[model samples]
Target: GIFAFENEQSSTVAPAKLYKALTKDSDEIVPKVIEPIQSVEIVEGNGGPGTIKKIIAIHDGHTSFVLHKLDAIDEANLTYNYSIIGGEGLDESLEKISYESKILPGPDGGSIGKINVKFHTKGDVLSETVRDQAKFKGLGLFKAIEGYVLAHPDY
Candidate 1:
């Protein structure tokens, strides 16, 4: 897509507990909570703003994104903003991809994590064929959370 697309995190209840899982150490918790997360280990650079990580995303199999950290642990706002600082995957076919998310207290006393994502082809075809087929990926992301929550009630 030349423009952008967004995915709402299906976890309203799950993320109320999932954040503890996210910050705990991706390597430790991710593999167990979300299938196909592969690994969430860290890489080095300027720490937050310039850090890089080798990731095997469920949709793309494996890739790396240099993360530009915007805000971390904003206890008051309860949101985080970040982007794929820079990286190349699939032979310069993809670029200008970014993602963001927010966690807010729900009306029922718990918190709701609504995730938003933005991505683009940078300078190439939109690949509707691939994009259309990949629509199922959203199901996986949300359902994985549901499955995790179902499997681990105590979380």
Candidate 2:
């Protein structure tokens, strides 16, 4: 079985800045701004499609790590897609989680980020609590990045 969800967030930062923070400078910026994220290391590839990133974080007083593989990156269009291939907290019944995200220019000169997430599972559907937690974490990180870009005008 598979469960899917979509979520969007509006940011006061420009699309290009937000996209750059997410795709280009994530390894340098994420750990610096986001308290939960301790580090981000490139496990494979060269920061392009097919790249694998290892992220270490602490949540609920426990340290965990996840491996993410980049599937596509369209800088001109501000679109990035990736999948969570392995992680410490991943449920045993789950296969993997894929994420397709895009940053679009907003009418107000800000940015609108849209994300589509698909949960590949082994005959078990994800629970509401898990889905909500995922949504919270995703949006929270986006806001943190937006805040960083907004604060650093030169970034």
Candidate 3:
């Protein structure tokens, strides 16, 4: 079975800049701006649909890894889709987690980030607490990236 949810964040950054930083140049900018992320490496494919990326992160002094595959990309529309195929957060009862994210134009040259998430499970259902935690972490990362892009206008 699959459990789905939607969430969004508003940023005072341009939509194209946010989209490029989040999807196109994530491997380069994420580790540099996000402190918890130690590194991101390309495991397979180019920077397109079907590409696989491995992310190494540290939380509470503990290190973990996640493998994500790019499912689809729409640069023209500022939409990006990906899936968490394997990782520390993916437990035995979970099959995978998929995400479809879009950056839309907002007021004052800002952007609205919309994300739809789906949890594919074996038998167990994910808890609301866990889902909220994930969302919180994502928001933190988004803010960090926004700050980075804001400061580095040349990016």
lDDT: which is higher, 1 or 3? Answer: 3
* Cα-lDDT of candidate 1: 0.49
For candidate 1, lDDT tens digit of each residue in 96-139? 44445566666554456655554456555756653663344223
Model 3 residue runs over 4 Å out of place are 58-63, 137-140
Pairs of residues at least 3 apart in sequence or in different chains that clash in candidate 2: none
Write out the backbone clash pairs for model 3.
none
Worst 10 residues of 3 by lDDT: 132-141
TM-scores of the candidates are 0.60, 0.86, 0.85
Task: Put down candidate 3 lDDT per residue, 1-155, tens digits, no spaces.
Answer: 78787878888889999988888778878888867789998889988899999999997689988899999999999999998899886655668888888999999999998888787877666766556666753455566777788798687
lDDT of 2 by residue, 92-117 (tens): 66688778889988878999999888
Ranking by lDDT: 2, 3, 1
User: Which portions of model 2 miss their true places by more than 4 Å?
Assistant: 58-64
Lowest lDDT 10-mer window, candidate 2?
Answer: 132-141
**Candidate 1, clashing residue pairs?**
none
- Whole-model Cα lDDT per candidate? 0.49, 0.82, 0.82
Give the CA lDDT, 0 to 100, for residue 102 in model 3: 91
